[PDB]
């Protein structure tokens, strides 16, 4: 009957029926085979625990995020994601709902083909459409011009769209944020003597990354005021009771977004990808991308973002130009709220692929 808007979220897979409220299920996904020997009689235990239970039960498993820098390394686990979700989360048969899948703005061939082909034959969804993720937040943002910044663990992207034609000469995929920010944070968590280094042990870090990191007004003076004794330190309580007091690194980690010099990695800050993308768009259009800059993805929820970003862009940007950054609340469900609108657009159900026509035309139609 009803369509299901299903986002292959980078994190943080999101699922919820077509509108108007929220994803029924959002979860970090994760599959983990159990690292330690079992002495349970039965044994009676899942071959791999998927999320959620593997994020209640960490450690006795080996967590594997299946989508590595946006690339689905084995779809065997992806299919198990789909099946687990559809059956034991959302509780539905894929044959019943025409589905909507999302993908990234730029991904290699045949990532979307192999997905599409397997998903049609395995789950036998009757009809489908596969959207690049940035575009759905455009429909979500309800703006008619502007550059979309889609940032989740572990792949960011920067897409310029004008009314209502895309800007191919300016599409940027940055592989930077966020799992590497997680790894970097872990590297500066060794600096406070806490070595939660194993892959599983990383998840807690991600939670301190959610909750405790902050973004400053400007680096140099926050580095200065860090030299001031005044307590930037915030206390995390750890799942063994331990209390961790972090501060310098607390504003240090996000600064990477402005300056990748911390990782070193040879890509420029959002600052420059903005400028350089704007300066790969036509002059006339440069007027209206300025003040239609749209950030996204759950990671962007750090309060000094965007006005750090604003102030940084204003420094490189030409004088008197109107620069304004559009920031939704709860950007993690931005995408999902995009998707809901799309699949609702009649008559563009008849621009959704249908299994019989797929039977006739195979992967050729996909592109």
């Amino acid at each position: 009957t009803t369509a299901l808007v299903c986002d292959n979220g980078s994190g943080l897979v999101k699922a919820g029926f077509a509108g108007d409220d929220a994803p029924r299920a959002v979860f970090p996904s994760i599959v983990g085979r159990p690292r330690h020997q079992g002495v349970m009689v039965g044994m009676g235990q899942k071959d791999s625990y998927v999320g959620d239970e593997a994020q209640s039960k960490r450690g006795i498993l080996t967590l594997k995020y299946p989508i590595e820098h946006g690339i689905i390394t084995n779809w065997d686990d992806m299919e198990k994601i789909w099946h687990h979700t559809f059956y034991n989360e959302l509780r539905v048969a894929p044959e019943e709902h025409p589905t909507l899948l999302t993908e990234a703005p730029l991904n290699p061939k045949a990532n979307r083909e192999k997905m599409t082909q397997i998903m049609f034959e395995t789950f036998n969804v009757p009809a489908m459409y596969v959207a690049i993720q940035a575009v759905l937040s455009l429909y979500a943002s309800g703006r008619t011009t502007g550059i979309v910044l889609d940032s989740g663990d572990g792949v960011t992207h920067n897409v310029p769209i004008y009314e209502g034609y895309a800007l191919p000469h300016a599409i940027m995929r940055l592989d930077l944020a966020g799992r590497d920010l997680t790894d970097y944070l872990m590297k500066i968590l060794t600096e406070r003597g806490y070595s939660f280094v194993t892959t599983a042990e990383r998840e807690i870090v991600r939670d301190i990354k959610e909750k405790l990191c902050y973004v400053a007004l400007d680096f140099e003076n926050e580095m200065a005021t860090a030299a001031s004794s005044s307590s930037l330190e915030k206390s995390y309580e750890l799942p063994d009771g331990q209390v961790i007091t972090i501060g310098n690194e607390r504003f240090r980690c996000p600064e990477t977004l402005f300056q990748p010099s911390f990782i070193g990695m040879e890509s420029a800050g959002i600052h420059e990808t903005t400028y350089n993308s704007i300066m790969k768009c036509d002059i006339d259009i440069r007027k209206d991308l300025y003040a239609n800059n749209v950030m996204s993805g759950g990671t962007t929820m750090y309060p000094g973002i965007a006005d750090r970003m604003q102030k940084e862009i204003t420094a490189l940007a030409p004088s008197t130009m109107k620069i304004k950054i559009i920031a939704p609340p709860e950007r993690k469900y931005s995408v999902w709220i995009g998707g809901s609108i799309l699949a609702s657009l009649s008559t563009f159900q008849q621009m959704w692929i249908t299994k019989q026509e797929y039977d006739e035309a195979g992967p050729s139609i996909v592109h």
Partner: protein, 131 residues
């Protein structure tokens, strides 16, 4: 649909058990029986899951169903044994009241775990009927 029926029955037995354990030494025989009645019901849940598993067609779901139902016997066996020990332990005055309270608590924890195992089984059973 006896799985839904059994899940509701299990909940009613657990609501009553919670009530019996708030009561006195007069609930001794009843507690032993409560554990017996729970054990009969678990044997029915296990039985139904094995019968449904035979008619099931997807290997993953069948396996996942087999994984969860195989722990139910062991918990039901532990309940019968630990209840026989606790039952025979009441009526003795040498043992401490705190240790006696802890035996009631442990039994409650085990019952809660049994109920959780059934809860997970119900969740998987509900999903399996789709396919």
């Amino acid at each position: 649909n006896d799985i839904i029926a059994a899940a509701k029955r299990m909940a009613l037995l657990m609501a009553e058990m919670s009530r019996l354990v708030r009561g006195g030494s007069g609930n001794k025989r009843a507690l032993i029986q409560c554990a017996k009645d729970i054990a009969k019901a678990s044997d029915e849940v296990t039985r139904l899951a094995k019968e449904v598993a035979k008619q099931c067609t997807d290997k993953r779901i069948r396996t996942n169903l087999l994984q969860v139902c195989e722990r139910i016997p062991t918990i039901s066996t532990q309940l019968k044994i630990l209840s026989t020990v606790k039952a025979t332990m009441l009526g003795r005055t040498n043992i401490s009241d705190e240790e006696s309270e802890q035996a009631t608590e442990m039994l409650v924890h085990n019952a809660q775990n049994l109920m959780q195992s059934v809860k997970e089984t119900v969740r998987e059973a509900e999903a399996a009927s789709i396919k």
